[PDB]
Amino acid sequence: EIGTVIDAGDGIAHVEGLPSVMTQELLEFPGGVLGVALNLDEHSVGAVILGEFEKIEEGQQVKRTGEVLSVPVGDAFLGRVVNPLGQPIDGQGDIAAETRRALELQAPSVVQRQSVSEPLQTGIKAIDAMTPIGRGQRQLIIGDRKTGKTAVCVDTILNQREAWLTGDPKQQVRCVYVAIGQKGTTIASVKRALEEGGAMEYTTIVAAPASDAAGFKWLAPYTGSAIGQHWMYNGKHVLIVFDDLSKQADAYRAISLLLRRPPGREAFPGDVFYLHSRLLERCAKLSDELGGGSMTGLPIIETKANDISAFIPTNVISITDGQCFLESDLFNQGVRPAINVGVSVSRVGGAAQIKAMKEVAGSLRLDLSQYRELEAFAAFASDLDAASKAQLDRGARLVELLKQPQYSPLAVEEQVVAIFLGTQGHLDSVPVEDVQRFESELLEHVKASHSDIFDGIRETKKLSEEAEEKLVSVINEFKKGFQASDGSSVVV
Amino acid sequence: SKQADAYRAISLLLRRPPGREAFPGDVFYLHSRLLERCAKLSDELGGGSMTGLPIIETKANDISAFIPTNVISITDGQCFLESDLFNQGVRPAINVGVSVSRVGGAAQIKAMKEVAGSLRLDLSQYRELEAFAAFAS
Amino acid sequence: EEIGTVIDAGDGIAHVEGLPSVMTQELLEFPGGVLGVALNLDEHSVGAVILGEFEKIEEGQQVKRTGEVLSVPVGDAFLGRVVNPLGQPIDGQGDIAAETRRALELQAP
Amino acid sequence: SKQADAYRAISLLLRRPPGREAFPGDVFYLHSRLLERCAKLSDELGGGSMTGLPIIETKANDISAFIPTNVISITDGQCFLESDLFNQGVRPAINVGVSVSRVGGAAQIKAMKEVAGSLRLDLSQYRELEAF
Amino acid sequence: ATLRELRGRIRSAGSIKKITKAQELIATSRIAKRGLCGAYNASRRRAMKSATDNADDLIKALTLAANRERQAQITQEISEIVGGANALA
Amino acid sequence: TAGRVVRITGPVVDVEFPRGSVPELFNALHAEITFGALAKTLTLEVAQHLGDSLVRCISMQPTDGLVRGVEVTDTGASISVPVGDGVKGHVFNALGDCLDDPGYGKDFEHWSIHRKPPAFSDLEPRTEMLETGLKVVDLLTPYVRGGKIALFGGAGVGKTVLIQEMINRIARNFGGTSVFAGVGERTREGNDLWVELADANVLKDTALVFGQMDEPPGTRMRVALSALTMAEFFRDEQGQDVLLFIDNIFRFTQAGSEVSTLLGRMPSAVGYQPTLADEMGELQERITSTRGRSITSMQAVYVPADDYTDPAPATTFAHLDATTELSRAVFSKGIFPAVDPLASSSTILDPAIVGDEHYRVAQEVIRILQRYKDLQDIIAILGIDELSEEDKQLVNRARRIERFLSQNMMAAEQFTGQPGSTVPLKETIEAFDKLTKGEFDHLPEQAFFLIGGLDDLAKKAESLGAK
Amino acid sequence: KTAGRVVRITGPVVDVEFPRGSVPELFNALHAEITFGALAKTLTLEVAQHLGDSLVRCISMQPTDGLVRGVEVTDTGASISVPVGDGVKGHVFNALGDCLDDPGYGKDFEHWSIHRKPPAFSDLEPRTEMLETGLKVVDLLTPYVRGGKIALFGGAGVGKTVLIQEMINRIARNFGGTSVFAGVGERTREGNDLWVELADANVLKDTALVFGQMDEPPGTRMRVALSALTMAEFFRDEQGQDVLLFIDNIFRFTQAGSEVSTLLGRMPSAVGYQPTLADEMGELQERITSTRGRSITSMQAVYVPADDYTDPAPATTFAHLDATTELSRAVFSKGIFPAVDPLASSSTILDPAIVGDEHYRVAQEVIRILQRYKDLQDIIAILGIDELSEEDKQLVNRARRIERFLSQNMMAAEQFTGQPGSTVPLKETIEAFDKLTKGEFDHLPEQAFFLIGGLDDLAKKAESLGAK
Ligand SMILES: Nc1ncnc2c1ncn2[C@@H]1O[C@H](COP(=O)(O)OP(=O)(O)OP(=O)(O)O)[C@@H](O)[C@H]1O
Ligand SMILES: Nc1ncnc2c1ncn2[C@@H]1O[C@H](COP(=O)(O)OP(=O)(O)OP(=O)(O)O)[C@@H](O)[C@H]1O
Ligand SMILES: Nc1ncnc2c1ncn2[C@@H]1O[C@H](COP(=O)(O)OP(=O)(O)O)[C@@H](O)[C@H]1O
Ligand SMILES: [Mg+2]
Ligand SMILES: [Mg+2]
Ligand SMILES: [Mg+2]
């Protein structure tokens, strides 16, 4: 069966014939071009061209592969950059594919899963303590441009370095980074950041730069999802980042409009929500009978003018297992990461944290939300009561504590100790302006003199009573020698 | 409002050209035709009458929407009910400042007209003076 | 001569069948001294935007070519005169001795 | 502004999908190709020139609307008359802060330049000073 | 969302306006007979008159923005509706 | 006498039949996908009669792999689901297939998912209060036994946590059957609910029907009808009290709007299907209690973009007896449950049913909160000190009241690490009456945050040092 | 035979029917003749779509006025090509490659197609070398990248073109490589002024000008950028030069694309823009990149419609830029030049790993102070600075002084004020802003910081105002 291109243009084609073509089938156009059949009617077949559509012409012969969209999958994809078809684009040679995997495969059923119970440490105090991410969770990194979303995702990928070095498949996390509509040099810089941190040893990049046709930008998240799913169904743990899904939505809208499907809100196709939802429901925590593997999703959404009420941001927020709002106003204030505490949450909750972090950070998010509310309320108070003053001081110290620079991941034990400092009142004596330094210094002290606390937390996942008392004693002893910038003693 | 929504559904399913808020071009005609049958007949026709009390449900107290605008234009007077007054304890929560009856005193008995003459002035003046309740001195 | 026929007309627009040699942006005469500009040309008909009294345009009317591409008269005679966008005097002071005709869509320097 | 409204009417009657404020996508092309023909010809072409004085009606002094911004991006400066000054009695009601002449500095006799060069920004700042 | 935020800001500014006007009148009465004084520390009647005028200006600007957003929302809604209808035409 | 596929555009399939064999509307048709990696049996619901013996249908399963001109078999009846006590304790999809035990229930009685609502004569209003144990719900939004309850709110404000809390507080001790309908929600949430019900031994009395958000629009539209059919069988045949939980009902409307344009319908306002209110009315009027037969329905309603003026929640509002609107502002202030006391309502919150004291206390609380909301902006700009002494007292009272309306819920233990608490109605009324009288103005407002009753208030106050 | 004929003419878009088997390839250049005396010319059409039944839809590069149905259309066999080589330097070309200042020039040069694929991913290298312009605001808060992509956003009349001229004066003058300036949908008189100014400054001999201005059909307005990019790409790839590429204005390319899409019958996306907006922008931008070992330092002005930064065009353009400088109407109103929005503007190399710890610290302190000032502005508009706390009053004074000091007297601004511009070294900028943040200059009047250079000019103007 050979069809004939009856028309072409703008990355779309209409082909007559091929009566036995399947929906979403992969068609071959002359010159090695590939298309995907989306619209099927008696008149013709509508196809989206996946690349170099300038070579398509009326009357060309089109063959049907007989296979729906699928991509190669295997461990050989680690450390490689590929296009949404799995073809390498880093110029390093062929990739040995273990097997093939269709892009449209149903997500694990409600009975094939188990509750998310394993932490996925991002190394970032704010996320790990306030909006924890478990393995099998979908956490949305949403915010304006230049708010640090890619920074958060790249730091999360880098923080898996130690887990990868452990060598235990139950601990290792394999990373897939899908870049959609990104400038090529930005993808190159991301790859450089992963390589300098030795993260490409266990990372695959699916790249659909803005130069690519809308088909590649629409498919790239599904290609990455299939590549991650191959590992997930083999007992591995996968973390997948989509940067961004709004670019996917734009590309899909372009494809749908060119195919002349009736649009809806903001000219988007009626099934854009279905697109994103069925993409993101494949990130799951499989049951023990299926190997116990998981895929953790980190979709990234860019909001224009902090408008989270737009169509795609609203859909993606409603889809994921929690969101991590980043605000430019918070970013400029020095709150880095600029996570808006009141609106950011994780629906997995404490189940995604270790016991020690759960105990230290039990009510941190609520405490900070209430602190922000009180700070807004008491903006122009002429004489505050004692309880309000204490709450404001504690909240300011906590806000200072949650600040963190870029490319500076913290081990789970160090984060536990820092949050213990913050929430147990040991920072009340320290001036706000010094809190950060104090925190860091104390960690180093515990690293060089009382490392047994870190080892105990890391091996037992719990802060024992004896360990807690020793930590308090060490905190006070360090306070004795600590030098505050203002000169005030931080003892008692 | 629900009748207008149902008629809009019917019209759209009939592929009639939509306008503002997807309503057809004769939704105002729908409501005006409905509400102009409430009349006060002359004595030659028996002197009967029918009084209309249409209800409109606004969203976010938006009286400038399409159907509310049409119905406000059609009717002879409006009673605006506000949830803010309702929560304040004012119940029925009729906003006397903006509610109006173009028929006016012609629809009141003499005693009611006499007693209620000063009520409007007093309420308007009270609304003006509201801000000074803290400084009675 | 070439003559077309109005195949439909409404709200300031008309469609004329025929006129195979009509240019783009050409001026067409509809009966009663009405004028139109041919914006859309296709194998079926020509879409003309009417300029003036559109209410005098009827289906079946005979439409004639002018041979000019949306031009207007130009010359020193226009000083002290009031004209409509077609260059026709509306002050009621008689004809205007136009030096020549200039097309409206000539490129800028 | 009324030409833009008429062209929008024509385009909508042609069932051309509109954009911002229901205007077509080529309304900017309309105004820009109109105003690019007001030029100062070179001496080779005779040295003649045409000076354009397009008028635009804003709504509530909103110079950030679509057509006003288009024309501002087309023309060589604007003389923004604001209703506030006009009603106060200052006529002509030129808004000193907004009004500007991009290519007007050269086209000015020596004395006028020497006298008004300061005056311009002096009034521009004295608006702010009088704000207090 | 922008329209709702603009309406909220308009009501906020209105409440500010009434409270400032009441303070101005009370200050006038007290003159005839806290920090809301304008620049005494760096008078309260002058400061409250200025605050009420600024609130009036802010309310007018917010109302203009809200009306612009209302018109834009109506136009965009009609654009989507007519685009769908044309697609189905 | 079988048809064949003619057009395929996503979840909408056109099928041509021989003359005289055109299936009736809503009939279930079967088509086969034979592709190795995606072999399956598509179930198509006849949605439109296009003429010329063509019918437009919605696919319940994904259409990837479908081929034009393939055999389509007409079953002669609408989508049917198993009914009977056997459904209790199992998980089903929109088509009635059992998930926890494939092939189970194939022999039970099968009821068509499309049904008419009860006759107006049979309908009879319900006014009995349903005591939950949450201060805010019990006081300001009393729930009706056998009535319709909704939990409105945007994304991530606490609708699902509140649904789980109500399952814990109502279903656990329920003496009748329960039906949960997970309409277009997260699969992880479905698994969590299944495991939770199994742990609490309440699954044996509960029937679960799940249609997830990764399924085509057809499943999301018809899963609610399937669950409602099971609930209707329990109400009408078994004649026992039924608990019906739906989460999220808005997904039904959203799926309806997804296929609207693909079905040839012109879009209504806000890109909604023109038949939004009609479909909503059919589905919601099928959810009701009849004379002598009680269904207590609790529905989580998603409010798109926190916009309560959106046509979907606005249309939904008319179908409810009690509504709890969760607010993004309350949520961001850290108040949980994030109920907006001023926007909530209950048809039984009048003196005739709840009593004079309850009504008086609720109205005073509402008035104080409204006044505090009015003074919010003045406080934000000019500061509190510029308010009158009465206004300052009211502001403090309102802050304490809004903190006290918060509570530590049992279903929220995994989020705060704090065990939940339950407050009897009389204690709630007494405590809020004391609050509105200024009896606790001396205690810090922080003492009123995420506690239970007055004993917990005293414990927290003495922990903070107050008394 | 093999030549098609016109069947439909709807504005710049023309449908051409060809004999079976002779249908031209997409983007091929066809030629048609308009013979009417006034409008006589040779239309160059670009094949845009294949409509089927041997029909092709093409975009006209010249106005189609006077074109007649059924006239002969001849296929050139190749897409639009433009001259390349050192010869192009010092001459003015249009979108089609025709030399305007010397007609017939370049017909003998090598000709390159204006449609090309972007460089392969393996050939891309991130760039992080700072470009010292000499402006305080740019150097401090959004340093430019050498070999990177810089954009200037802003509404109508905020200083996009003046800033482009400033950067041409500060970068192109002392440049050992080649420059290409692409005027895209801009004022023709602005193009003439740029031509004259580059001739006077002696920079023209090293610069190639390509002008498709406002009074051109949308096809030309959307293809002139591709022509100039082709010239720049030849200079980058073949001659191994460091190429400067100035584009003014890219939003005009997007808007012309929108007009063409409307004329092509495509269904419109949000705000009436073309469905392929992001894809066309991606192609054009990704062609502008710098490859490994070969540097193109591009600088594009982006018009923001109705001052709406949420508009789809700039919204999509944002992602293609290493450095972004957003010009604000609010800043412009205050008379601050350049009218840069320090909070909105950004740069990818403003991190301590590239610009050093001191520069990053000073920039972040300035940004924090300005953000706090912006947050306070809402109370301030109502109640002056009088109700703020002492810390807030001090911060507001510091922020006002900082925002005045971010303004500068620019070289290109002399024609508007007669004041010669000033250049501030990066070290002096960092020192001065560190002092400002530390509060050392809080005693000077605000006007002392308005439109000056470094610390010496600050002292001179403070003396002129009777201050320390
Ligand atoms: N925690 C942090 N501390 C300091 N700087 C940070 C931090 N996170 C990000 N940045 C900086 O903020 C800028 C934006 O970072 P990033 O690229 O991650 O943001 P984004 O939101 O993904 O941006 P875009 O819209 O360009 O994709 C970069 O300069 C990055 O170095
Ligand atoms: N640094 C400056 N000093 C003084 N005046 C300036 C300065 N920059 C701009 N202007 C004034 O602003 C006017 C507009 O500047 P410019 O043409 O560069 O803006 P633009 O953003 O390119 O505008 P448009 O959208 O109209 O093309 C200039 O003509 C001049 O009047
Ligand atoms: N009682 C509570 N205490 C603390 N957090 C809560 C409570 N209820 C809800 N939340 C938070 O609200 C978020 C959304 O919860 P959920 O109800 O599952 O989503 P939705 O409200 O969209 O249905 C969760 O991440 C959870 O942390
Ligand atoms: Mg990013
Ligand atoms: Mg939920
Ligand atoms: Mg300019």
Q: CB B88 to CB F314 under 8 A?
A: no
Which chains sit next to G, with 3 or more Cβ pairs under 8 A? Answer: A, C, D, E, F
Tokens representing A378 are: 């008491």
Within 10 Å of residue G26's Cβ, how many Cβ atoms? 22
Q: Between helices G426-438 and G357-383, what is the axis angle to 10°?
A: 50
The amino acid that residue F115 corresponds to is R
| Alpha-carbon span G195 to G100, nearest angstrom | 11
| Alpha-carbon span A432 to A429, nearest angstrom | 9
CA of G154, closest atom in ligand 2: 21
| Alpha-carbon span C75 to C97, nearest angstrom | 7
Residue B7, Cα to own-chain centre: how many angstroms? 21
- At F243, give phi and psi (nearest 5°): -105, 125
Cite the DSSP H helix spans in chain B. 2-13, 27-35, 66-74, 83-88, 110-129
| A with E: touching (≥3 Cβ pairs within 8 Å) | yes
Tell me the residue ranges of DSSP E strands in F326-397. Answer: 345-346
Expressed in angstroms and rounded, the spacing between residue G161 Cα and the centre of ligand 2 is: 6
Write the CB contacts of F223 (distance below 8 Å, at least 6 apart in sequence). Answer: F93, F94, F181, F182, F183, F184, F209, F210, F211
Active site residue G160: yes
Measured from CB, residues less than 6 Å from any atom of ligand 2 are D 72-73, 100, 102; G 154, 156-162, 303, 337, 410, 413, 416-417
Contact between residue A175 and residue A157 where contact means Cβ atoms under 8 Å apart: yes
Expressed in angstroms and rounded, the spacing between residue G186 Cα and the centre of ligand 6 is: 7
Write the CB contacts of G49 (distance below 8 Å, at least 6 apart in sequence). Answer: A7, A8, A9, A10, G26, G56, G57, G264
Tell whether omega for the bond before B18 is within 30 degrees of 0, i.e. cis. no
| Alpha-carbon span F413 to G73, nearest angstrom | 76
Reduce the DSSP state of residue A296 to 3 states and report it: strand
Work out the burial of residue A329: count CB atoms within 10 Å of its CB; fewer than 13 is exposed, 13-18 middle, 19 or more buried.
middle
| Alpha-carbon span G12 to D35, nearest angstrom | 20
| Alpha-carbon span A359 to A394, nearest angstrom | 18
Tokens representing C1 are: 């001569």
Expressed in angstroms and rounded, the spacing between residue F200 Cα and the centre of ligand 3 is: 21
- Of C30, G62, D8, the C-alpha closest to C38 is C30
| Alpha-carbon span D94 to D85, nearest angstrom | 8
Residues of G within 8 A of F384 (CB-CB) are none
| Alpha-carbon span A121 to A134, nearest angstrom | 8
Tell me, what DSSP letter sits at residue F76? E
Closest-CA distance, F381 to chain G, in angstroms, reads: 7
Residues of F within 8 A of G382 (CB-CB) are 381
Structural domains of chain A ordered from first start: 1-71 (2.40.30.20), 72-356 (3.40.50.300), 357-481 (1.20.150.20)
A123 lines ligand 1 (CB under 6 A): no
**From G377, which residue of chain F is nearest by alpha-carbon distance?**
F381
Closest-CA distance, F201 to chain G, in angstroms, reads: 52
**From A246, which residue of chain G is nearest by alpha-carbon distance?**
G316
Q: CB B13 to CB F265 under 8 A?
A: yes
Distances (CA, A) of A334 to A404, E60, F77, G369: 10, 34, 64, 10
Write the CB contacts of F90 (distance below 8 Å, at least 6 apart in sequence). Answer: F98, F99, F100, F101, F104, F105, F207, F208
Tell whether omega for the bond before A244 is within 30 degrees of 0, i.e. cis. yes
Q: Given ligand 1 and candidates A146, A183, A185, A298, which is best to mutate, with the most ligand atoms within 8 Å of its CB? A: A146
Contact between residue G189 and residue D52 where contact means Cβ atoms under 8 Å apart: no
Which chains sit next to E, with 3 or more Cβ pairs under 8 A? Answer: A, B, D, F, G
**From F377, which residue of chain G is nearest by alpha-carbon distance?**
G379
Characterize the bridge pairing of strands A70-73 and B77-78: unpaired
| Alpha-carbon span G337 to G158, nearest angstrom | 9
| Alpha-carbon span D41 to F15, nearest angstrom | 68
- Of A405, A423, A418, the C-alpha closest to A446 is A418
CA of G249, closest atom in ligand 2: 27
Tokens representing A181 are: 């509509």
| Alpha-carbon span D82 to C41, nearest angstrom | 45
A336 lines ligand 1 (CB under 6 A): yes
| Alpha-carbon span G336 to A18, nearest angstrom | 65
Written as one string, the DSSP assignment of G312-323 is HHHHHHGGG-SE
Q: Which of E1, E80, E83 sits opposite A307 (nearest CB)?
A: E1
Contact between residue C103 and residue C69 where contact means Cβ atoms under 8 Å apart: yes
| Alpha-carbon span E85 to F247, nearest angstrom | 32
Reduce the DSSP state of residue A176 to 3 states and report it: strand
Characterize the bridge pairing of strands F148-153 and F322-325: parallel
Write the CB contacts of B110 (distance below 8 Å, at least 6 apart in sequence). Answer: none
- Of F444, F430, F453, the C-alpha closest to F365 is F430
Distance spanning both ends of chain F, measured CA to CA: 83
Which method resolved this structure? cryo-EM
- Of F42, F47, F60, F39, the C-alpha closest to F14 is F47
Expressed in angstroms and rounded, the spacing between residue F162 Cα and the centre of ligand 3 is: 8
Contact between residue E55 and residue E17 where contact means Cβ atoms under 8 Å apart: yes
Active site residue F159: yes
Q: CB F378 to CB E16 under 8 A?
A: yes
Is F381 an 8 Å CB contact of chain G? yes
Ligand-binding site membership of A65 (annotated):
no
Q: CB G267 to CB A250 under 8 A?
A: no
Contact between residue A450 and residue A470 where contact means Cβ atoms under 8 Å apart: yes
Expressed in angstroms and rounded, the spacing between residue G165 Cα and the centre of ligand 2 is: 10
Q: CB G306 to CB D64 under 8 A?
A: yes
Reduce the DSSP state of residue F91 to 3 states and report it: strand
- Of A398, A420, A411, the C-alpha closest to A469 is A420
- At F183, give phi and psi (nearest 5°): -100, 105
Reduce the DSSP state of residue A117 to 3 states and report it: coil
Q: Could you tell me the strand order of the sheet in which G92-93 lies?
A: G92-93, G207-212, G178-184, G243-248, G296-303, G149-154, G323-326, G346-347
Residues 59-88 (E) with a CB less than 8 A from some CB of D: 64, 68, 72, 75, 79, 83, 86
Domains in chain F: boundaries: 1-78, 80-347, 349-467
Ligand-binding site membership of A156 (annotated):
no
